[PDB]
Amino acid sequence: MNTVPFTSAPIEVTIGIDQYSFNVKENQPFHGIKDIPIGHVHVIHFQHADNSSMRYGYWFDCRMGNFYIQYDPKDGLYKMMEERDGAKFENIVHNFKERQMMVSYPKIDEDDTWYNLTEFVQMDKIRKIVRKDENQFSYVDSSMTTVQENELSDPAHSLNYTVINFKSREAIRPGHEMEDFLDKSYYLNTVMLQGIFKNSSNYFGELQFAFLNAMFFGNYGSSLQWHAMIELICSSATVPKHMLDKLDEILYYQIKTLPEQYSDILLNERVWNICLYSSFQKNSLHNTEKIMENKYPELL
Amino acid sequence: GAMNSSNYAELFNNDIKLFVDDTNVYRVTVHKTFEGNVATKAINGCIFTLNPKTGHLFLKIIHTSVWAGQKRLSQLAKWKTAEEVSALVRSLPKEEQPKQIIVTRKAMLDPLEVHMLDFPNIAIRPTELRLPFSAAMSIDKLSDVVMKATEPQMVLFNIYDDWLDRISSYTAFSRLTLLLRALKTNEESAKMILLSDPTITIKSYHLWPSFTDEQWITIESQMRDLILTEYGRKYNV
Ligand SMILES: CC(C)CN(C1CC1)S(=O)(=O)c1cnn(C)c1
Q1: Measured in Å, how far apart are chain B's first and last C-alpha atoms?
Q2: Domain A116-299 falls in which CATH fold?
Q3: Considering only CA atoms, which of A120, A295, A287, A89 is closest in space to residue A201?
Q4: Could you tell me where in chain B the CATH 1.20.80.40 domains are found?
Q5: Selecting from 3.30.420.230, 3.40.50.10210, 3.30.2350.10, 3.40.630.30, what CATH number does the domain B9-163 have?
Q6: Which CATH superfamily includes the segment(s) B164-237?
Q7: Buried (b) or exposed (e) across A112-142, using 16+ Cβ within 10 A?
Q8: CA neighbours closer than 13 Å in the CB half-sphere of residue A111
């Protein structure tokens, strides 16, 4: 179990750690988060009390270094930084643990939610979507645009998700226009899985990371990406059975975790109705169809 | 984006554009089977691709053999239309390729866009106009070449005959749409108007009769009357 300590908490802020969140008051004596499960990526995120504009946060994996948070009063945000001096960092944390000024990552032992949401997510792939190679952790916020969004402006602050476009030459083989547009299996399996992602685990990883950035930061382009990757599978007549089974589990836990109140903006009616009711895979997503129908019957 | 009454003069500017109408591509007669079920029999069809500025009509004849052994024909017909329009564009010299293609039915947008990916600068547009191009098979010489075809075939016409020697393309398009609207609303009466007088003939190289300017005004009035008439017989007004 690992620890992300905080130098201080100078501004009132709602702090998130994965799917958990708690309120810290202005100059409350908060010095971080302990007992963070090893083995998973994590995201620690922030929404300032005074300006809910810009949710922002850091993806990290404690196996890759010792990270802490210091509020920067010049740039006005909580920054993640990596301490190289192991002994100095551990000693402070040791001592901080003694004065009990840390919140405990509150994992219920029965609960596999976070694992289920991050099953295929790997820091190494996050760091290729979010390019900032001098840090082991990745910053994301509400406003960051995707490469694809920019094609339709600051390249270094972009989310470099894999571009998916159903009406593109990449998606459509010359001479198979109708075939490839109505059955995207070529684009899914040859172009994307064999070609770009190499395997379904990397595809699901990017899909899950997109969803999580949409949910935690309201990042609209991430939501576009999450729906595109869903629609590409559902619109393919030929999908490995193990992918369909895993997809159903992935989406089930994403729908289960989504705040009920945010469904209006995070869920694309067209894509979901199409995927659950009209697409080739309309009958292959039993768990997701059941939770969507019991929880968001309005959308459909 | 969409073409409508507000940007109607754009049709006659000097940017090459084509209308594409697919309503006569897949055509059937519905009939009873021996067992009392219903079956369809395809008949020859055509893609109606028209430059509204010049009158040039690219009539691609769709022979019934293209449907043989195929499923979901109404959906295939949109993609076959798109394929043939794309092949037509590639066959044209660059300076003759359209800058816009306007489809008369919105269902053609994705099929044509996908077939035209190689031409990203050709704008594919819908229209809010209710154009009467389905009635093109009420033009006898067009109907005749479609029904007689025994193989896929492209036939080129000028749907304005020689009218552009005397009128503008705006006026010629208006005349065409009025004639086609009339033929669509009441083909028999429309054709009676057009041919009642045997002294006015159709030149072998034309589609419509050789009316003088004064006779065209009479004809055009008769066709309006007919449309308003039928609109009365229809609604009882
Ligand atoms: C929350 C604490 C872990 C933050 N520090 C960690 C050990 C690096 S610090 O020692 O107070 C510190 C703050 N700024 N600098 C340069 C060092």
Answers
A1: 37
A2: 1.25.40
A3: A120
A4: 164-237
A5: 3.30.420.230
A6: Prp8 RNase H domain, fingers region (1.20.80.40)
A7: eebebbbbbbbbebbbebbeeeebbbbbbbb
A8: 12
Q: Which of B76, B83, B114 sits opposite A181 (nearest CB)?
A: B114
Alpha-carbon distance values, B135 to A252, B72, B131, B177, B185 (Å): 52, 24, 10, 10, 9
Under DSSP, the state recorded for A156 is G
Q: Specify the residue with its C-alpha closest to ligand 1, atom 6.
A: A89
Q: Is A100 on the interface with B (CB under 8 A)?
A: no
Cα of A40 from ligand 1 centre, angstroms: 24
Tell me which method was used to determine the 3D structure: X-ray
Ligand 1 near A92 CB (within 6 A): yes
Cross-chain residue pair B114–A172, CB shorter than 8 Å: yes
User: Token digits for A191?
Assistant: 């172009």
> CA nearest B78 in A: which residue?
A178
Residue of chain B whose Cα is closest to the Cα of A168: B117
A101 lines ligand 1 (CB under 6 A): no
What are the residue ranges of CATH 3.30.420.230 in chain B? 9-163
Contact A149, A222 (CB under 8 A): no
Angle subtended at Cα A201 by Cα A195 and Cα A206, rounded to the nearest 5 degrees: 80
